[PDB]
């Protein structure tokens, strides 16, 4: 019942037979911007199925010495499909997300991944007074890896990261995690190329281990923008 789940958005569908419920961030569901909160007066474009669909990123390899991975939204999707085109052709963007993380193994494997969505994950640099640069933050589709996951790369604690919307992938229990993110920002809309509302982090708290024959164990991320809308149409930046 709570272990099987089908997600269908646009022309895309995902089925999992080993889910563990799914998390709605702060008990909220994505929605379009209402008139009593709107600021931009131009009529927005709402592509619906053209942009509200699952985009699958490149898989990463779960290794013994893996420290963790992160992707920043909407930066990771800003050059992908019709969502990327609408982002490039518009000054203002607004949407939620539906994140589905996939990682399967055998019943002889062990391991635990914390899959956490951090709002405004302002990263810090290690052992220097210089702030992180543009290239350190904006990794796009490929994402980045945690330098010090123990402190979430920002001087805080990984132990308290459960205060953020999150799930676990415990290999003996489940093979996927699902998180629904509403619009999370101080402003009703934002310039998608210079600010990231959310950061998806996957951290191997319990390392992958087995004594059976070793196989490549990938982790795959599928993200579906939800209730997309764009304002301020102009020429493409790209």
């Amino acid at each position: 019942s709570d272990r099987v789940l089908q997600l269908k958005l646009g022309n895309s569908a995902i089925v999992t037979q080993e889910a563990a419920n799914y998390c709605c961030a702060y008990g909220e569901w994505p929605n379009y911007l209402p008139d009593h909160e709107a600021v931009a007066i131009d009529k927005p474009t709402q592509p619906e199925t053209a942009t509200d669909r699952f985009y699958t990123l490149k898989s990463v390899k779960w290794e013994t010495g893996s420290t963790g991975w992160w992707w920043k939204l909407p930066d990771a999707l800003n050059n992908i499909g019709m969502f990327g085109q609408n982002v490039q052709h518009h000054y203002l963007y607004r949407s939620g997300f539906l994140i589905h993380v996939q990682c399967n193994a055998t019943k002889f494997h062990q391991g635990a991944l914390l899959v956490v969505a951090i709002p405004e994950h302002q990263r810090g640099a290690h052992n220097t007074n210089t702030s992180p640069g543009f290239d350190d933050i904006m990794k796009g589709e490929e994402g980045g890896t945690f330098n010090h996951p123990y402190v979430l790369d920002d001087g805080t604690s990984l132990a308290c990261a459960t205060i953020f919307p999150h799930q676990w992938i415990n290999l003996r229990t489940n093979n996927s995690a699902t998180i629904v993110l509403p619009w999370m920002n101080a402003a009703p809309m934002d310039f998608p190329l210079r600010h990231n509302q959310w950061t998806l982090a996957i951290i191997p708290v319990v390392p992958l281990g087995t004594r059976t024959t070793s196989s490549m164990v990938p982790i795959t991320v599928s993200i579906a923008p939800m209730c997309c809308e764009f304002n301020g149409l102009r020429h493409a930046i790209t």
Binding site: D2, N21, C23, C24, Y26, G27, E28, I163, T173, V180
Partner: protein
């Protein structure tokens, strides 16, 4: 005592006892019934 004309000049407001911890403790679509297995 607030004789100022701007409402933001007023003293602190310490009377909002409303809470909703479930938005952080149980942010799941399917509520978990007490006693029954979660999965």
């Amino acid at each position: 005592i607030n004789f100022y004309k701007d409402s933001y000049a007023a003293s602190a407001s310490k009377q909002d006892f409303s809470q909703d911890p479930s938005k952080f403790t149980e942010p799941v679509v399917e509520g978990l019934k007490a006693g029954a297995p979660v999965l």
